[PDB]
């Protein structure tokens, strides 16, 4: 299995904390 990548977008986060902002920052 690979790290934790997002659903729609070529990016990855190390902790849900940052992965969350990514969603609130999606657009």
Applying CB under 5 A, the residues found at the interface with Zn ion are: 6, 9
Shortest Å, Cβ 11 to Zn ion? 7
Shortest Å, Cβ 12 to Zn ion? 10
Shortest Å, Cβ 2 to Zn ion? 16
**Which one, 1 or 27, has the nearer CB to Zn ion?**
27
Report which of 1, 2, 11 is spatially closest to residue 20, judged by C-alpha positions. Answer: 11
Q: Could you tell me the two tokens for 16?
A: 């849900």
- Count of CA atoms in the C-beta half-sphere (13 A) of 27: 2
């Amino acid at each position: 299995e690979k790290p934790f990548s997002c659903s729609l977008c070529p990016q990855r986060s190390r902790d849900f904390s940052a992965m969350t902002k990514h969603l609130r920052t999606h657009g």
